[PDB]
Curated annotation (Swiss-Prot), chains A, B, C, D, E, F, G, H, I, J, K, L:
Fourteen CLPP subunits assemble into 2 heptameric rings which stack back to back to give a disk-like structure with a central cavity. Component of the ClpXP complex formed by the assembly of two CLPP heptameric rings with two CLPX hexameric rings, giving rise to a symmetrical structure with two central CLPP rings flanked by a CLPX ring at either end of the complex. The active site is at residues 86, 111. Detected in liver (at protein level). Predominantly expressed in skeletal muscle. Intermediate levels in heart, liver and pancreas. Low in brain, placenta, lung and kidney. Protease component of the ClpXP complex that cleaves peptides and various proteins in an ATP-dependent process. Has low peptidase activity in the absence of CLPX. The ClpXP complex can degrade CSN1S1, CSN2 and CSN3, as well as synthetic peptides (in vitro) and may be responsible for a fairly general and central housekeeping function rather than for the degradation of specific substrates. Cleaves PINK1 in the mitochondrion. Belongs to the peptidase S14 family. The chain holds residues 59 to 244 of 277 of the full protein. It is an enzyme of class 3 (hydrolase). Its EC number is 3.4.21.92. It catalyses: Hydrolysis of proteins to small peptides in the presence of ATP and magnesium. alpha-casein is the usual test substrate. In the absence of ATP, only oligopeptides shorter than five residues are hydrolyzed (such as succinyl-Leu-Tyr-|-NHMec, and Leu-Tyr-Leu-|-Tyr-Trp, in which cleavage of the -Tyr-|-Leu- and -Tyr-|-Trp bonds also occurs). The gene is CLPP. Its main location: mitochondrion. This is ATP-dependent Clp protease proteolytic subunit, mitochondrial.
Length: 165, 165, 165, 165, 165, 165, 165, 165, 165, 165, 165, 165
């Protein structure tokens, strides 16, 4: 990792930029939550920018990150570079309305590649969040989350996951 | 871990914030106890904030941390992000009255997933602590600690683990 | 890695030089994207220089890097040292017209050494990008991408991958 | 493995019974093909019985086994015990008409959990085989092979994979 | 491996059947050569049957097996089940004229997935053998051995690798 | 380990605090002895504070630490947090009279979970040290050192291991 | 290894056939020497046949095998299948005059791919053996033993390693 | 590695000295190329010194380093310490005329201890480079590249690899 | 290891203190020799203090350390904490007369838990050193070095290894 | 290991032949001793033949085997094939006078490549055995056992290790 | 292990011979005890022969074997070949009076290379057994079991461990 | 490694001291050569001191170091501490005349514990260097380099390896 004593990621964070790359798990979630809290303490009015390039991850960590993004008062812009699959698509769709962007050669997946009841409760939570942020019906979300396929930025724009491309 | 020579966790600790993430064991307990002691030596009147995202851990380490939190004179606020299960739920319920908070998509579990007598003594200790801090009866605690299930923040509010959500 | 507290790569980055060496995967793609973004934030008018010595990599990471290079407003010069094979040949051909260079003893390969449909979509994307940047027909690209062989800088000049050697 | 110098599987093979259990790969395919050839050499008029309990496998091995079953002149009965998923469902549906059976608590899956073109040719081969043996249209097969779900013996009976249950 | 004290492969060898499955290397070549020598010593007039299901292997072992098949006086029939790629396609094409067979769902590949001169001499040897047994020209063989693709039994019939399907 | 260039443990050592956590072995003993020597060289009149959370360790290392504690002229206070078992209980009982403290939920164990004569000699040494510092008789010590059980701070107060709780 | 209770190699040994395949080391040398001794004890007048397919090995084991071959009174025929390199070429050339054979697609190499003096003595021993059995001069042998290349059966016929091909 | 915050290698690089020690592969080639580029950017008129102690490496990395050395405008002196074998001998011979030096006890070897055609093209490239820089004929180079032996500095002086010793 | 940028061991070395802990081998010997040389270069009149807690080690390293201690002109004090066994007892006894100290609970062992003659020469060297520094006869040393037992500081004082305790 | 239900080694043992190949350690010694005891129980008048191809081993195992050979009443012939080094040379020289043989290309070494006194006693035992069986003086044996070199059968004949070659 | 379907050890056991070779642990003890029980059930009047070549082992297993030997009614002869150290010397001395033999080049050791009290009880048990079977005094046994040295058969004869040599 | 930001080795290098400890291989040789070059560039008139404690190493690295020491113009003093064996004895003897020292308890060994000709040429090189620097005859060097033994400083003084002790 090249340096600028700052690293490249710390130099980027000086510009209020959080990078969510690679699989999402508990350590990544903790680091992202800490970065968001630090950025909010620096200022609660300035926008934040998130760049997503992720193959997916765990449901609990993604839900924690989503809750933290919805808690703070700053506007948040989300940009898809490369991949946004499974949990990354939730974060991409959870940005501020009018501030969700993608690059022309990006793929978006909302299909998902403890006991038997907690998994059902978490899945229903995901359905409700997706329906709230996409403005679809619940049945449409359950039907779409079952097919194993990717989407282009124009398809995701028609669905309701993105605003511009 | 991005830096700010401070790291992100040290930058947070400058704001009097202790982070309890991941499984709780002896090393984590020692680090948390040292951080709490240093924070108290800095000042014995200012509040402290703890953020919990934990799947559980060992009983001895959790009891040590609970004793240290009850020893110092500072008020302590507890915030649940993500998960609070097994030993993390004890720490969540052990905060100062009126200062126990949770996020809307959080799951709370009080069920627990040497010789034969020390284990029973530690379990009775846990029952007594839970009954003291939750204001339930002992029989209710023993019955609830046997079912394998999670709780929503509203259920934990009705039980007595939280104050607000 | 010799130092100059700067390293040799950081000293080179001070001169606006990005080095793409070794196989291309998600970590390399993330580092290169971050470096390009930081360089653009430093200035959006100054040229950038990229040096490629790569045996290939993953399609998604190469597409992400290609999209980032096409997004920023700076002119980009590409220089082949050693090898440019598979994904590295896309980056070599994607530079600014008139600013694509190679050394006399370099080998260039465009042959490539999830479900069954996403692979077809990514391959058609590659065909379209290659045809756009090389000025060949699509059939020529699909025919050439099937033979297992390397090319000299003069053959790559005749094809359309390079501008000078 | 209990013995009867014969083992239990050899004692079963004395009754003209071939067992296809566990994941299907090249070694399993070779053993099954050799057993079928030996059984045919013993007699080319007597029926054979196959018991399938398999989570899936490789396409090439399943196609080889299917071709061998279609080559020999003996009638073949197929019985599903437990699981028949991915490649096992092809073998289950490829039995002699009127001789395809399942147990009441069995799950059947036809969704599938080299270069880019050979995979597509093999997929089209699978579509044609499934449409021939199930009596569906090709579009129905491609639509059904995309959803990630299992089937009950009554659903598989309505589809055309089974004859009785 | 089920038994019949004979195994299934030894029971098959009682019927004058040699099985060439899996990758071809020195141990496999030695076993196949020993089996062919033993079969010839049993009788030098009776036919032999070979079944090929192989992804490829080493050139030296395949050349040794080819030489042994060409040495003995028995007629040899070759049957493709599943795969015949790289070195296995040489063995498939090297059978007795009029006795080279394949199954309808089989894939045949003749492309190939010490010092610098011995490799070239072995390649020229392969070109000469292929041209002799297929009745093509040398230039056609060199051109075809460069494209990375598989063939159907009808294409291999038109080329000259098979006699019937 | 969070920093304050000081670490948290070095920041604590600035306050004259030595932390004895985890199993006690030769490396831990050497570090603790060096810290005690450095603290004495800083001043030979100021008190020192030790915090013990230990499951036990080796007899030789504990004896070395005990000897170093008894050598220096500074008063030493011992505080039990969590666990004090086997060798940790020796260190807890070896503090200055009137300066041995414990937390309400702490467990204390004195039972212990080369040739045959050195082990017995070291055991007699332990018996003599315990009898000297606890004010029991030798027979009481050997009887209590045999039962496999833990003690509460009130039982340890009655025995003579602690002064306050 | 298929069986005939005899194995294929034991069935071959019934026909007075010794197989020298794979790298030659101490275990292989011991097995071959024991087989040759047993064959001589069975009869001291009947011929023996050896088939060589070997990439090379250790000098001491090859010298032991050569000495055992020269000791017994039986005629020995040597046949090259596949490869005869380094130590295998010594065994190939050490057969009875007029009884050294090779297959048309075989490669023969005589170049070789403790203290500093024993290695020189062993090399001079090899030079003397080669010159004796090939009828070349010592200088020719030392010159030829230095070039890194293989030979065809006609070249080895001209040199003196073989009698027929 | 002793320091002077500079290391010993960085302190040497301050004197315009590049050290090529150990086997040459892609990482070493990238580091050496970056160092040469940085040195040229510091000044394009001052000489550079390279010390070679290398057993060999990969052809592609050595060709990349050779091309970079021939590209820059600075004079380059090459010094052999210890070993210069295989790829290192190319770098030793590729220095500026009159500036190629060796130590009295050094050994130089030019013998060399993808598909079948690319290796031949790379070998012919090596032959042409060696003939250009040594002033031998191509046949002499091909003959000398086959013998497995080392050379003394006087022999390499007579050949044309060195200028002084 | 806690810091004071100095570490605890470097802070101790500022007070002219060398710590010999753990097994003694070549790396430990080299570090100790370098520290002693640096301390002598700082001053050749000031005393040095060594603290020994060691289970033993290799004879050659201990002899090297002993020779270095006897070479320099500074007085040296030796202090036993914990253990001094095998090679550590040599270092303990090799200090300046009147400056060899031990703690009350320390154990001292002089029994020791290439070709056949070098071991005997090294043993005779050890006997001579021990007899010189302890003032015993050689026969007493050889008799005592055979029994497998430890000693108390009073026994070691009577023997001649220590001066005070 | 080829079979004859007998193996090749058991078939050889039927002819009263013991094979000592590979390094000599405790397991090999136990097997050889058991074989010699069984052979003696079969008959105490018939000769036994031993074949040695060994690089050496442990002194205790070789001494045990030597003692067992000297105990039984049968004549023993020793034959060197390949190597007889270190412990194997003792066994070779310990055969019955007039019955010690070697092959022309064999190397013999008598140099040898607990506490410090037992090694001396075992070495003196070896010297005495060698002097007894070779008819040299002790000083000659100790001088010869120090040089690192091998011997030819003629040198070993002159020394006294062999009787014929 | 050569066979005679019997192995060499089973063939020896047919002659009433038990072999105790290698380290003695629980598995070896169980096998030896089972063999002794089987031999006694075959006949309770016939002698048994034991051959010892052992470096030592665990005290509990040796005591179990000693008890079993003392329980059965058969006479037992013990023969030392090679080594009898630690636990093996107990078994050697525990044979029937007048039936304890050794070979001339054998070494015998009686020095020995849970809680602290059980080890002492087991040691006192060993002292009593040794004094009973050797006819020494207890003090002599304790003194002799401390020196680290081996014994010759004549020394063991004088001590009382053997009867003849 | 204790620090003084300098380490102990860098602090020593400030005094013009190079430490050659442990086995000598290519990395150690490169570091030593770089240190010697840096020291010469600092000054070409001041003396340098080397301390050797080495068990040996590789011939090529030792020859490279020897050549570098003979190249520079500074006087060099060599001091033996501990061991100087194999390649380290060459470095010890290669110092400036009158400046070769050893400690009283040091052992010196000159015996030494690719193809077959390069090893012999390197050995002859070693013989010539040793004879030049020791003033012995070549035959004496070859005879002495064969015996496996060490030397005392007085023996090495008589030989010619040292000047004082």
């Amino acid at each position: 990792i090249p340096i600028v004593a700052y690293d490249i990621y710390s130099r980027l964070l000086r510009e209020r930029i959080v990078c969510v790359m690679g699989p999402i798990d508990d350590s990544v979630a903790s680091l992202v939550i800490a970065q968001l809290l630090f950025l909010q303490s620096e200022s609660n009015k300035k926008p934040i920018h998130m760049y997503i390039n992720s193959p997916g991850g765990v449901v609990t960590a993604g839900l924690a990150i989503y809750d933290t993004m919805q808690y703070i008062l700053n506007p948040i812009c989300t940009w898809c570079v490369g991949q946004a699959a499974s949990m990354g698509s939730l974060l991409l769709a959870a940005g501020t309305p009018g501030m969700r962007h993608s690059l022309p050669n990006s793929r978006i997946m909302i299909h998902q590649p403890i006991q038997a009841e907690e998994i059902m409760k978490l899945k229903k939570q995901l359905y409700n969040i997706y329906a709230k942020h996409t403005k679809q019906s619940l049945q449409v979300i359950e039907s779409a989350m079952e097919r194993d396929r990717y989407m282009s930025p124009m398809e995701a724009q028609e669905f309701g996951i993105l605003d511009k491309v």
